[PDB]
A paper describes a structure:
HG3.17 was evolved from HG3, a higher-activity mutant (S265T) of the in silico design HG2 that was engineered post-design to reduce the active-site conformational heterogeneity observed by molecular dynamics analysis of HG25. Over an evolutionary trajectory that yielded the HG3.3b, HG3.7, and HG3.14 intermediates, a total of 17 mutations were introduced into HG3 to produce HG3.17, resulting in a catalytic efficiency increase of approximately three orders of magnitude. To evaluate changes to the HG3 conformational ensemble along its evolutionary trajectory, we solved room-temperature (277 K) X-ray crystal structures of all HG-series Kemp eliminases, both in the presence and absence of bound 6NT.
To test this hypothesis, we generated a variant of HG3 that contains all HG3.17 mutations found within 7.5 Å of 6NT, with the exception of N47E, which we omitted to favor the formation of a unit cell similar to that of HG3. We also included the second-shell W275A and R276F mutations found to widen the active site entrance. This yielded HG4, a variant of HG3 containing 8 mutations. Kinetic analysis of HG4 revealed that its catalytic efficiency is >700-fold higher than that of HG3, and equivalent to that of the average natural enzyme (~105 M−1 s−1). Crystallographic analysis of HG4 showed that its structure is highly similar to that of HG3.17 but with an active site that is better pre-organized. In HG3.17 and HG4 however, only Trp44 adopts a non-productive conformation in the unbound state, with an occupancy of 62% or 26%, respectively. f Cut-away view of the active site shows that its entrance (top) becomes widened during evolution, as indicated by an increasing bottleneck radius (reported as the average radius ± s.d. calculated using the highest occupancy conformers from both chain A and B, except for HG3.17, which contains a single chain). Crystallographic analysis of HG4 reveals that mutations proximal to the active site are sufficient to alter the conformational ensemble for the enrichment of catalytically competent sub-states. We expect that the structures reported here, especially those of HG4 and HG3, will be helpful to benchmark these future enzyme design protocols.
Residue numbers in the entry: 4 to 303
The structure:
Amino acid sequence: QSVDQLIKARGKVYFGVATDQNRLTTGKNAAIIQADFGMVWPENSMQWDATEPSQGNFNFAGADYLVNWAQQNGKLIGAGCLVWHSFLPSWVSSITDKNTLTNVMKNHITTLMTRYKGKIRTWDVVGEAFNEDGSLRQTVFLNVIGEDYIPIAFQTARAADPNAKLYIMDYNLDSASYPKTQAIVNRVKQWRAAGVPIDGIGSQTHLSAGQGAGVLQALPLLASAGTPEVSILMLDVAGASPTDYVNVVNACLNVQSCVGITVMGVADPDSAFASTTPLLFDGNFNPKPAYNAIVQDLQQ
């Protein structure tokens, strides 16, 4: 049974998954995505180091394949991350002029978003901008441009494709008493009051065993920032306990503005954390107990 169809029946937009070309051509990934998921994200093919490995010169072969596949199969598309220190090529992190880096960042955003204009439901514009104590992470963008880089990125993105929902995303937003959770709420409220077009907060939900329960309180706190949408993305859970997965799903159902959930991958062996077997399908592409528990939870 399709978790995407069932979550849509409960009033949400999608249950999605991250993938890319060589997953769609191997294993049983394409068949599972076709049957069970409503939205696809590029795992790597839209990141900066994959799309702009040298200045002004873009690589789109991998991203084009995924966008075309999604359109042919009637799936929604999410994409990202436009500005994320973890996937920056060296040529960007060696720029020291504020004007130059601003133009480089705007060109990167505008080029990617224009190519797929109108085809992408959600863009992750800025990722992992916060330290664990809630201060802003001292990346090349903060050091060279200053805190204005976040407003600039979102303004540029809105102009490039007004149809897309624009998100900021971060991890370790899984507990309501963790300082980073309240910090992103504080800053997003301030940015939206200044007219910055942040449509969503995406919570990168990479969980250890037993941490699902905390999301029931953290996700409503994230929603208190007043963005139109929030989402769970990059979801995986060490051990893949049904209890942890059901708690995350119910957090989504309890938060009106939470539009859906994206899991990090299909089958355990293709996880970056494969030894923790943290996904919903096993190494033989069989649905795991957590998958069936989600199905039952969505039907009750």
